[PDB]
Each structure stands twice: as C-alpha cells, then as structure tokens.
Amino acid sequence: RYPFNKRGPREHKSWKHHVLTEPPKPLQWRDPKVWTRDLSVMKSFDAPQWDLWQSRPRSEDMDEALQPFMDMPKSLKDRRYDIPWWANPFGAWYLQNILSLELLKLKSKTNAEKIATYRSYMRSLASGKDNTMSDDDVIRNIIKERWKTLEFGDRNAGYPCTFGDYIQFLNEWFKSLDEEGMQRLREHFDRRIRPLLAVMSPVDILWLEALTQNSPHNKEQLQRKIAFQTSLGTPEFFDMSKRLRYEINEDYKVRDELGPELFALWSKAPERWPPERLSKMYGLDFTLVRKILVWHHFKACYDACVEPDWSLPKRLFALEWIRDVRARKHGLFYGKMRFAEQKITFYSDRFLFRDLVNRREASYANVWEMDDPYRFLQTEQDYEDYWGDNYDVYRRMFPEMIGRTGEPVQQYGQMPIWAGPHRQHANKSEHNWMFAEIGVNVGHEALKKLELDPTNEKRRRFVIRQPDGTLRSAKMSEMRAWYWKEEWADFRFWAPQMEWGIENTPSQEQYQEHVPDTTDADFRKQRRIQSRPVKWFYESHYTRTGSFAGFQPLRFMQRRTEREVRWPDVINAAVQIQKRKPAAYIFKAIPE
Amino acid sequence: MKYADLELTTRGEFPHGMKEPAFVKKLDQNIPWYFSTYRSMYHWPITGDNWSDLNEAEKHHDLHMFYTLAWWKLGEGIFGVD
C-alpha cells in the first residue's frame, strides 16, 4: 500500500557522504616518473598495445608505421642516422640468406641419382617414387626454413638481430612503400596471413609467440593447458601450417588461371570476343565462369602494364547490375540485393514459352548484333540505369537531368494609390512580406507541379513586398516553402546520407547523457580524429543524393513501448538504456 | 636507412586478440538482461561514394596490416611447399 504511513520519505544517507571523499587526494608531490610530464594524469603501467594510434588524436603517429617508433621522442629520432639499407644488421641478414642465391650450395647429386631423376622426369611410369622433388621446391623449402631458424636477440650472443633492429628495418621499409608496393604487400597479406587469422585458436598462442621468440605472462600455465589440450588430438591435427591444405573444386586451379586463356586474341580485338566464346572453356556454372573471366581480364591487363576496364564487371554482369539498381530503387537501401528480398511470385511451368519461341526464331544479320553487350536495353529507363555511375556517359546522354532553367524572379507593377504621398509611407516597412495564395483550387500536394508550372494560368500565386515597398514574384525556394516538406533521396547509384547514424544523431537521443563533441578522439563513436571540411565542398555533386528520414530510430524512440521483463522491477522498454546516476554529485574544479 | 642501434626491452604480447581475460566472481551489475536489451544508433557503412580527406579505410587498414605482418614476421616460415 502507501509507503508513507508510519513515516515520510527517508532522507537517511541522502548524501551517502561515505562516497564523497576518499580521505586521500593529491599534492604538489606527484612523482615525475609515474605521472605524465605535466602531472596531468597517471601513466598506465600495463604492457604496451601495438595499436594505440587508433584511439588518440596525436599526429606524429601517422608519420611512422610501427607503434614504438610513433611513441619515440624527437630527441632520440635525431640520433637515428641515414645509412645503406644493408648496413642495418637485419637488412644484412636478409641480404645473406634470402636475397643472395649464389652463396647457396646444394647437395651434389651422384650420377646414379642424376640418371634416375632424368628418366623419371622425361617419362613417367606408375608406382615409382613420387618424391622426385624439383630442386626449386628444395630451394624454397630451404629458404622458408631459413625464416624458421631466424631468431632475434642480442647479437654479441648467438642471434643475428635485435628485435628493435628488425622492426627498425621494417619501419623504414613500410614508409618506403609506393602504390603497387603496398598493393603487393596487402595481396601477400591476404594470401598468407588472413586465412591463418581465421583458423587460429588459443591452443596455438605459445607457438604463435615462438615466431618472434617472445616470452608470455602466463607461460607456465599455458605450457600445461596447451599440453593437456593438444594431448586430445593428433600432432598433425593441431599444427597451423597444414590447416589450409585442401580446396573445393580441384579441376580449375587458381595457379593455372594466371596465364589467361587466349590472351593473344581477345587483346587484339576485344569486341569480337564477347564472354560467350570464352565461357565455353569452363565446366562451371554461369556466375562462377563470368567471375573468372573478369579476373582474367584484370590479370592480363596488369601483366601488359596497361590499366584494365573497370566497367567490365558491369558489362558481364549487366543483368545483375540492373536487377540491383532497380531493387535498391524499390526497397530503399544501398548494397547488393540478397535472396530474402526476392519476390515470392510462383510462375506456371510453361511460363517461359513466349520468350522461348522468340529466342528460337530470332535471326541476326551478323554475329556482333547477335551478342553485343547492350542488347539488355530497350527503353530509356534502361539506358539510365545502366549508366548512372559514369557521370561522363550520363551527363552527355541525359543533359536535361541537371536543371539549368528556372522561372525568373520578376517585379510586379504596383497598384496606384490615390491618397498620394500621405499614404506612400505605409507599404514601405521593416520586413519582407510573403503572401501565398490558398483556395479550393490551390495548395494540394497531389497537384503540386501543375501548380508551380509557369504554363498553367490557374497557377497558385505568391507575392513578396520588399521592405522598401516594391513587390516581386516568389523565388522557387519560397514557392516550395508553402508545401509540406518533401524528401528526395534516391538509392540507385550513390548512397544517400541517412539519419540517426553514429555521426548524425546529436548526443541526447543517441546516448541519454550529454557527450562532449570534441573534433578529436571520440571513443564512443570509434573515430580517431576528425578534420571537418565543409560538407559538400570537396565531393562531386552527383555524389550528393538526398536524405532518408523515413524510418523509426529504434535506439531513441519506438512504437508500442513496453517493459521487456516485468520482474525484476529494474528493466524498462528497450529505449531506456542509461548508466547509473551516482550517490550525490561531487564537483571537481576544472581549469587543471 | 635512418638506423640507430636501439634496445627495446619490453614488447607487449602477441596481438592474436585471444588471451584468457581476467576473472572475477561477483560483478557490478548482476543483470544479464542488459546484454540482450541494449541497442545503439545505426552504423551506416557509406554515404555518397564515401569520400574523406583523411583517408580512413586505406590508412587504418595498412597500419593494422603492418604490426600484424611484424608480429607474424611476414608469415614467411610457416608455409612450406605443398
């Protein structure tokens, strides 16, 4: 019942004054070692993260590749002197073992071996030794294991390189990279590292540390844990080198599509070679084989040191292109239409008959007409969706989509005032005066364009009296001001700017607390730093599309608000997320 | 190029992202529902071709890629010849 029989609201520990002060605060005695240089804040003494640059808006970071060198004071950075790259001891080691071939001695074959090897190589007879290993595999094995055997440390002892020395070489090298340099790099990263990044597991962490020979915190307990767990499978099972061994579809190897097929032909007249002529080569299905043809074109181009046609994936996939443009138009989204969003129509069995006899009976003057790239298109709509992306082709072919013409702002003639000068002051005043007309024949959104049309004489009339007393027709902005606000956003080529995002929504809706807006280091918004140019200045104008406000912003406010869980009494509707408010507020003075 | 012989004594552990975290018994909020109930504002991947003066995607990718390559020592000993 009523909480307030027997007593009123309890004021007991309302300050909760045990929470106000800790009885120990600070001083002028703050340790210069353990604090910031400024004595601003405490230093964090846990192990260094290698990514820290991403969380803090400091600009020297971005002048160096690896993290420790970003954190380096300038005074040390000066005592790094420019010397030849191999004078760097790691560059030396790399020069000896990896880059120097001629210093490599191979075990010399006997004559028996020479003959057996030769006769195996020229004519294969089954059941024989399947090794017969090419010395190129031997060589590359020797090199890769030279990367196994490479170890860091102090170099007056056994090892060739200081860890710092190696990441030094690395750092100077990563800054040294050009476009296709770091392209070759990222490629080499995706082919080697990235798959491993997906197949990893706790069971490997020790081994993962045995690459740099670095010492872990728990090393004993991980010894035991990983011993007990790797005990539960084959040693073969658990090692990472062999985890990528097999591939689906062995008949077409990525290695053999490196040489592109008939590159000596479709190079020379790429028109007479539509995708069909080639696609008869692969025993695959349609989507896969066109995919492959794209990759061929690109490999080929990169090989002949010319630039590839980037519109080729649009041309081979044209049907998919337009399906997507139109889907994006229909359901309003930017992306690629996936399966759940297909229509649920069920066709009859013979549905294709009309088209089937149309195809079976088609005839063509030459073969180019037969399969040209553009037979996908008839009406202008098609030509508009197939080229929306090149503002080149589009701007040329559709000149009237950028409005260059408008209803000129004109001055109206004033009505004569008989009272003369006596009243001539009256219609001259402080402000502008807008007058928009309404009536049964005017102000309906349904009819809007007919109403703003210069050719229609029942056209809705506006007038504006300037503060000096003249009158002019409305500017088109003013005209449109008098209709209910209208959203233009179209999704087919570039993504329109959408509301209620991370960077869009101001604080109080997004989080229920005030969050300071600083142009640097917003941790909540996962941004490092922000330069804020004027929004639409540096971008291309066709790239500006519109704004979609047309949905519920579920973090903020939703329909049929209700408690998720009635008990315990604590949970609310899912819109009420918030941090706990403390026992009574403590205010620290903050000039600092 | 730009060499000096530097002694870097402590390198933090491997960024494998999987390390047994610190264990507690009691927790601050005993209310697990909050996990499922929490929502956020929408993360929109793209606006208008996604142009930026600071080139964020490329630059951040490359920086991560760098220390990842460093710690794997360029993945160069791990793969034999299949």
């Binding site: 600070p26 003494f45 400091r58 | -």
Partner: peptide, 21 residues
C-alpha cells in the same frame, strides 16, 4: 609516450604516485 616500452608489466613502481619525502 615512449616509456611504455621499457616498463615491466606487473611492476607499477609507485602505485600511489606520491613521492612524499
């Protein structure tokens, strides 16, 4: 910022931060 590389992870040499005297 450069100090983080030479510290020993478990040791927080002066947890209080106060030299006192």
């Amino acid at each position: 910022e450069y100090y983080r590389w030479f510290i020993q992870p478990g040791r927080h040499p002066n947890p209080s931060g106060l030299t006192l005297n």
